[PDB]
């Protein structure tokens, strides 16, 4: 009795770090096909959010595992939902083109490039002559009138999206398997790394909208009282800055044309929706952001960057530098079509330490080369009517540029373009733990013989 004997306990709370695989689980309720979410174990009405007490855990983004398999479960699912579609090798034919009208507006002068070419019909030994047109970022001449070829017929094989599926994003929850748990930081101002003094255990994360965007995060999740600046090792010019906003700013991108569509058969058995003629009169495709709100939002961000670069410095914004198109511009998809804006009239107007509308010209590509790869390209079928979509901006991606000495104010300019930063602005407060429910301890006890 005075000496002690051991005692085996089961189900005692300890957790130590690990990593697993995860499965998706998202439904609410006609919705024929998205990039695949058919049943995928439909969710539960009430999520359980249990609050812990007297518990602190060191947290760290930039070293998570939930990022590196979020990004593997998009590009491995994108190719899957495009494998059985129509492929098109016989599009890469040398084709003749001309410019348009006088069109003396001078915004759309030399932009639309009507072309004509040969294309194989159903029967093998007859030919079909077709007329179509393509935006200026899809044809490249071969060095009076000259010939043209599609922009990707030396790098990757073209394939067409199936005309039934839709790329509109739906929410996705991640859930950990039975015998694991996912923690969750629950303060308001969280600068990415550090101790989070009030954690909470759930099993399935909140609704993640997996949009694709550059330089401006769209339809994201908000923040609280003041905006937050997050990075890894600032004072390093090669790492981004993931700004998250407080109040949202609306946006009204649209397109005014009408754009009839036609369809022939390539053959024997695959159709091909090309882009017919434009009825009406042509303008650009543009976007509006209200000037009174956007002035206030940059005023709120630049008060926050003073804490990380000294109080006496006179912050200046600028344009993007250069490179390929998906880095120097703002790009997204609206209903099934891929825009490419400019955003030069936003990141102007330097600062000093002491009703309107801004228009944005946006040109359009049809052949995308997404996720920075080579060896897999994609055609996109056009859409009848006009295109209208409203969204709201929650989040910027700024890139500091260099210098040597602290001589009057480092400048900022957008860009980044890498896809993993899009999924770090909502997986910044989750890590995966493993329950180890055994344990031994001594007490004054003895088994009856």
């Amino acid at each position: 009795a005075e000496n002690l004997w051991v005692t085996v306990y089961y189900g005692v709370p300890v957790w130590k770090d690990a990593e697993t695989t995860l499965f998706c689980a998202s439904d609410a309720k006609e919705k024929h096909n998205v990039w695949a979410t058919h049943a995928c174990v439909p969710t539960d009405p009430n999520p359980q959010e249990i609050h812990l007490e007297n518990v602190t855990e060191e947290f760290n983004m930039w070293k998570n595992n939930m990022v590196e398999q979020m990004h593997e479960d998009i590009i491995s699912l994108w190719d899957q939902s495009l494998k059985p579609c129509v492929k098109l090798t016989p599009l890469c034919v040398t084709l003749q083109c001309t410019n348009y009208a006088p069109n003396l507006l001078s915004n759309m002068r030399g932009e639309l490039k009507q072309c004509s070419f040969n294309m194989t019909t159903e029967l093998r030994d007859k030919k079909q002559k077709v007329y179509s047109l393509f935006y200026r970022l899809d044809v490249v001449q071969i060095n009076s009138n000259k010939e043209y070829r599609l922009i990707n017929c030396n790098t990757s094989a073209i394939t067409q999206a199936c005309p039934k599926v839709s790329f509109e994003p739906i929410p996705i929850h991640y859930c950990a398997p039975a015998g694991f748990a996912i923690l969750k930081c629950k303060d308001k101002k969280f600068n990415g790394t550090g101790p989070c003094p009030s954690v909470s255990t759930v099993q399935c994360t909140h609704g993640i909208k997996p949009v694709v965007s550059t330089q401006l995060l769209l339809n994201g999740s908000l923040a609280e009282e003041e905006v937050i600046i997050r990075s890894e090792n600032i004072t390093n010019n090669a790492k981004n800055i993931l700004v998250q906003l407080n109040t949202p700013v609306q946006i009204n991108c649209t397109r005014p044309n009408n754009n009839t569509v036609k369809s022939i058969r390539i053959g024997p058995g695959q159709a091909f929706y090309y882009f017919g003629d434009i009825i009406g009169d042509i303008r650009m495709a543009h976007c509006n952001v209200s000037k009174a709100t956007w002035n206030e939002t940059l005023g709120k961000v630049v008060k926050q960057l003073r804490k990380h670069f000294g109080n006496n410095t006179i912050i200046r914004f600028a344009q993007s530098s250069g490179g390929d198109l998906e880095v120097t511009t703002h790009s997204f998809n609206c209903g099934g079509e891929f825009f490419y804006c400019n955003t030069s009239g936003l990141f102007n107007s330097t600062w000093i330490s002491n009703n309107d509308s801004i228009v944005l010209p946006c040109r359009i590509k049809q052949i995308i080369n997404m996720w920075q790869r080579i060896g897999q390209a994609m055609y996109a079928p056009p859409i009848q009517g006009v295109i209208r979509c409203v969204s709201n901006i929650t989040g910027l991606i700024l890139t500091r540029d260099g210098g040597s000495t602290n001589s009057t104010t480092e400048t900022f300019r957008p860009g980044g373009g890498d896809m993993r930063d899009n999924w770090r602005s909502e997986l910044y407060k989750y890590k995966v733990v493993k329950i180890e429910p055994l344990g031994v301890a001594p007490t004054r006890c003895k088994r009856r013989v």
């Binding site: 051991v6 005692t7 189900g11 957790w15 695989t21 015998g179 031994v440 088994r447």
Partner: protein
């Protein structure tokens, strides 16, 4: 009113040992293949320690009683300043070498003794 799953993990060891049934119920409950590599992984981590309790004599209990004496070179401390001034997440770090000796001593000196005692006691 009970707190919930992992609810008392900041509490002391004396109070968190009362609500042990909560952490025991919720331990078992072409892209379905990642769902299927999770339902097999969940059931095989559970069968492992359910095997490991079955060989210690603790077949279906939660607070089971054993018979090996505490060597007191594993933890010098008293009775009182363990159950009141430590948490479970901190006790499992201090004893943490000292545990492939216990898991060997807990079954070899007991179920290979008790079952060779009753087979030599129930002869009569």
């Amino acid at each position: 009113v009970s707190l919930g799953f992992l609810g008392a993990a900041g509490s002391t060891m004396g109070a968190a040992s009362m609500t042990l049934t909560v952490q025991a119920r919720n331990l078992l409950s072409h892209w379905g293949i990642k769902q299927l590599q999770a339902r097999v992984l969940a059931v095989e981590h559970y069968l492992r320690d359910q095997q490991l309790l079955g060989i210690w004599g603790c077949s279906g209990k939660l607070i089971c009683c054993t018979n090996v004496p505490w060597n007191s070179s594993w933890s010098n401390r008293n009775l009182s300043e363990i159950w009141d001034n430590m948490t479970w997440l901190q006790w499992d770090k201090e004893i943490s070498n000292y545990t492939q000796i216990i898991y060997g001593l807990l079954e070899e000196s007991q179920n290979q003794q008790e079952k060779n005692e009753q087979d030599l006691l129930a002869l009569d």
